[PDB]
A paper describes a structure:
The E. coli 50S large ribosomal subunit is composed of 33 proteins (L-proteins), one 23S and one 5S rRNA. The 23S rRNA consists of six architectural domains that, stabilized by the L-proteins, define the shape of the 50S subunit with its three protuberances. Here, we present a biochemical and cryo-EM based analysis of the earliest period of 50S assembly, utilizing an in vitro reconstitution system with purified rRNA and L-protein components. Taken together, early 50S assembly occurs in a domain-wise fashion, while late 50S assembly proceeds incrementally.
While state d1 can mature to d12 and d126, an alternative route involves state d136. Both states d126 and d136 can convert into state C (d1236), a process we refer to as core formation, that enhances base pairing between the 5‘ and 3‘ ends of 23S rRNA. Domains I and VI exhibit full cryo-EM density within their domain boundaries as soon as they become detectable as parts of discrete states (d1, d126, and d136). As we do not observe a state consisting only of domains I and VI, their contact areas may be too small to drive stable incorporation of domain VI in the absence of either domain II or III. This suggests that domain I together with domain VI cradle the missing domain in d126, or d136, to promote the appearance of domain III or II, respectively, to conclude core formation and early assembly. The presence of domain II apparently facilitates docking of the CP-forming 5S RNP and as a consequence, route 1-2-6 involves the possibility of CP formation either on d12, or d126 resulting in d12-CP, or d126-CP, respectively.
Author numbering:
A (entry chain S): 1 to 85, 95 to 110
B (entry chain E): 52 to 55, 70 to 201
C (entry chain Q): 1 to 117
D (entry chain L): 2 to 35
E (entry chain 0): 1 to 56
F (entry chain J): 1 to 142
Write the structure that this text describes.
RNA sequence: CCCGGCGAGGGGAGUGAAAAAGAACCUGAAACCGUGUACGUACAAGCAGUGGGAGCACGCUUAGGCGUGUGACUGCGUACC
RNA sequence: ACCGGGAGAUAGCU
RNA sequence: GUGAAGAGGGAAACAACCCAGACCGCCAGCUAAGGUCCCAAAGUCAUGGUUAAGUGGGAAACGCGGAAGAUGUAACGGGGCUAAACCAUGCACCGAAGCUGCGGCAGCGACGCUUAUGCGUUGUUGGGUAGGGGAGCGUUCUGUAAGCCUGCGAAGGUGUGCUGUGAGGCAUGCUGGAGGUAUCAGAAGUGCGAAUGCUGACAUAAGUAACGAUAAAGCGGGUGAAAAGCCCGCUCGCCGGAAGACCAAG
RNA sequence: GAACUCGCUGUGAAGAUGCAGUGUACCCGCGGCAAG
């Protein structure tokens, strides 16, 4: 059963969070969560947040067999930015796609 | 433009007046009597040649009822009819107001748009003689 | 009577960019440089359409010279023999046959040698 | 035959619109040159 | 001291190719409590090499 | 109708041995370049080379006529600062005539990716013995 | 209902024609930046394109050499006003 | 010294 | 004469030198100048000599010398060349957008069937700044229009295919769910690409120096999911006619 | 303005990274030397 999770208007840079997210594409959740918990970047917190939300949703909507779930697609994009006196604050939009097969 | 190296109200800027903004002007012009009468004669000749003109000496309705006008129109086997008469009749004029297709005017109420637009025109002997004694 | 030019401009931009496929990034997406890139590509196509005849003639001449040298005669002598034999075979056909067949080219060179004198 | 009414040939001319394109004959400057 | 042109995306991609970090991939399971933890560090529950600590 | 184009992989290239032993350097270089480029074959194609592997023997035995026995000199830029370390052709042939033969071929051969590809096809040896005897190199003279 | 920090955000169920209508709320293209898919590249020098072009995957006349996506290589080619 | 108006003030020239 | 306002070719590239006037296309042949050892295509051509000097392939005047020059030979274009240099003659080829061969158009006349005013021949023109003349496409609005299409799917956006010398036109997949509009005319706030043109949005430099007094912090505990800069206690240190406290103004 | 941003020789509204010939160089980062 395909599962998708995302976060809206995150207080993080669009591209800084991508570095940590690159460690979740093609990696199983079992070790991905451990890597995220021990990652030093601030974006690691958001990545583990979206990962735990996605795994919880997969467990809830799906019947059973949570361990076999494999991460397939995960990507980040730039979101709305706020202007201030000239300084622009960026926002990040993270999406994680997890499916058993 | 309401407002105050160029002024912000310039046409190149936004919210500014146009370089050549149109002002209240009349597009109407003058038409000579000779050309008007010639065009009227030409259009009447074309219409009669096309066989789009039917003349009935009497086309007066007994009472001002749109039903009578509609059934009379059906009896004539015509749909697009411009009923032009020398003397306007109160009953027929009142009855024809509701039907947009059927319109009636007076002897002096002759315009090129009315003739060209309406597919067919119906007029009486009084109307034809009146127009004949008019500009013609 | 205001007229909005957005639709016309968008259509023209789409039409011009449609021919700007695969031009190393900016030139394929940026109209300002895409127009210049497509104009230059059209000029190069115009030149190369005429230069294609020259390239093909060069290739045919090279192939005919190679075949003649293989048979044991220079290109000029082979052409002279062919002309003196009342034969008007174009170089393109000779080059085409020199690769798919050899017996025919051997006969042609023999005839050219015989008619050279 | 209502729409068959058209101006007589040669009685109407749009007139060249200067300062519009390069392929319309005169190009920039409005056709008056330098 | 001023750019004469705009660097393209490809140059940025090549320059940023070395910005990727590396996963530790060195999880160590506790001898007794049996939870993965960083090698040569105290576990979250407060165990290291099986021996117990204060673990506030 | 499209003209036949040589296939870069299906072209067959054999081995032909060449030995000058007292022939003009220029003539041998010209013939070697022409035969490596495949212009002799009827299936010549500028797009893809179709030449045959050539092995050169007795490089030091090449013959040079005229005052080139002393006038001729080869120079290759040494780089860095003041890299003018030239090399007279006599010393170069005395040490390693393979360098002289290969640089002559490179100068004769067109320079470029295909130029280097064809250059790789030409091997030059000083001794008569050739270790490429397993492919049956045919004997051809020029 | 759940994850979540008793937030923010998200995912199910339902309402809802449509939630590819969710309070940032009609339709929603480019410049800008992302993931997957097909192809090329780590011995190859210059307005980066143009003709030739083997190869690399797919559907087609179920081959019959048709097109689509890329172009290793090659003759030529010193931007706009 | 600043604001609104004469004032879309006027000549060259880009 | 050329450029201005002509592309093409050759001379290493070169706006002033030589040949040479581009309607479009064709994988056909012949020639101009210039070349036939290659790069880069064509004779390693033939006849009799000169050139042994790498002159050729840079040099005067003057009496073979003159000659020394472009850091590299670097003044042969690279190799390389004793003919692959020069002189005189000859044929054979390569060689431009030049000519011819074929196909397809716009214009100019000339000639006739003279027509219904088109047709069939006909020779020729079709590079082009400024400028002039002629001929067209596309968009809003109005009459044609209470006509026609459209919830069995229109606008805008996004792909495909078919068309024409051309602005361009038509059918069609895809979210869309309410207007669009045949033909002929009239009427324009009408066709964008540079004016340091203007409003809005978005990349570069960049994860870059810096994070703004160099008085100097550290520990235990508490709130908090997250804590050195959030809070309490403790050790040390800075200012201490101040970095201490109060008034006038804000 | 856009970049697949090399040295030397020659031409050059006259010192060429984009012109012709020529030689070298696996792709991409880090700290400095400031010749342009």
């Amino acid at each position: 059963m395909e599962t998708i999770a995302k976060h809206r208007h995150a207080r993080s840079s669009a591209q800084k969070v991508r570095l940590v997210a690159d460690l979740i594409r093609g990696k199983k959740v079992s070790q991905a969560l451990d890597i995220l918990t021990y990652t030093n970047k601030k974006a690691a917190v958001l990545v583990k947040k979206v990962l735990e939300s996605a795994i919880a949703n997969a467990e809830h909507n799906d019947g059973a067999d949570i361990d076999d779930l494999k991460v397939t697609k995960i990507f980040v994009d730039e979101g709305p930015s706020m202007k201030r006196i000239r300084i622009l604050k960026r926002t990040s939009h993270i999406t994680v796609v997890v499916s058993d097969r | 433009v309401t407002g105050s190296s160029g002024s912000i109200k310039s046409p190149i800027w936004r919210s500014g007046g146009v370089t050549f903004a149109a002002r209240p002007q009349d597009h109407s012009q003058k038409v000579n009597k000779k050309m008007y009468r010639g065009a009227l004669k030409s259009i009447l000749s074309e219409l009669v040649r096309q066989d789009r003109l039917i003349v009935v000496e009497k086309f007066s309705v007994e009472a001002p009822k749109t039903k009578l006008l509609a059934q009379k129109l059906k009896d004539m086997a015509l749909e697009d009819v411009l009923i032009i008469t020398g003397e306007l009749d109160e009953n027929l004029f009142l009855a024809a107001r509701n039907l947009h297709k059927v319109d009636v005017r007076d002897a002096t109420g002759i315009d090129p748009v009315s003739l060209i637009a309406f597919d067919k025109v119906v007029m009486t002997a009084d109307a034809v003689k009146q127009v004949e004694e008019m500009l013609a | 009577a205001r007229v909005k030019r957005g639709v016309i401009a968008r259509a023209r931009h789409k039409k011009i960019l449609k021919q700007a496929k695969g031009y190393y990034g900016a030139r394929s997406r940026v109209y300002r440089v895409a127009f210049q890139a497509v104009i230059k590509a059209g000029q190069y196509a115009y030149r190369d359409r005429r230069q294609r005849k020259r390239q093909f003639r060069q290739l045919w001449i090279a192939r005919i010279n190679a075949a003649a040298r293989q048979n044991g005669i220079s290109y000029s002598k082979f052409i002279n023999g062919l002309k003196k034999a009342s034969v008007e075979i174009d170089r393109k056909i000779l080059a085409d046959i020199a690769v798919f067949d050899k017996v025919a080219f051997t006969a042609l060179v023999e005839k050219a040698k015989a008619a050279l004198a | 035959r209502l729409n068959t009414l058209s101006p007589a040939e040669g009685s109407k001319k749009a007139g060249k619109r200067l300062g519009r394109g390069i392929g319309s004959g005169l190009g920039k400057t409005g056709g008056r040159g330098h | 001291a001023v750019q004469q042109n705009k660097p393209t995306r490809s140059k940025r991609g090549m320059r940023r190719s070395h910005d990727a970090l590396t996963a530790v991939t060195s999880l160590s399971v506790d001898k007794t409590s049996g939870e993965k933890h960083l090698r040569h560090h105290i576990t979250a529950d407060g165990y290291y090499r099986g021996r117990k600590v204060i673990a506030k | 109708m499209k003209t036949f184009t040589a296939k870069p992989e299906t072209v067959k290239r054999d081995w032909y041995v060449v030995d000058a032993t007292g022939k003009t350097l220029g003539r041998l270089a010209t013939e070697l370049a022409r035969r490596l480029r495949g212009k002799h074959k009827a299936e010549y194609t500028p797009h893809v080379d179709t030449g045959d592997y050539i092995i050169v023997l007795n490089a030091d035995k090449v013959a040079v006529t005229g005052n080139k026995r002393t006038d001729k000199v080869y120079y290759h830029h040494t780089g860095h600062i003041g890299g003018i370390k030239q090399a007279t052709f006599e010393e170069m042939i005395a040490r390693r005539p393979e360098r002289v033969i290969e640089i002559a071929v490179k100068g004769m051969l067109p320079k470029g990716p295909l130029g280097r590809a064809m250059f790789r096809k030409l091997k030059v040896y000083a001794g008569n013995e050739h270790n490429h005897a397993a492919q049956q190199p045919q004997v051809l003279d020029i």
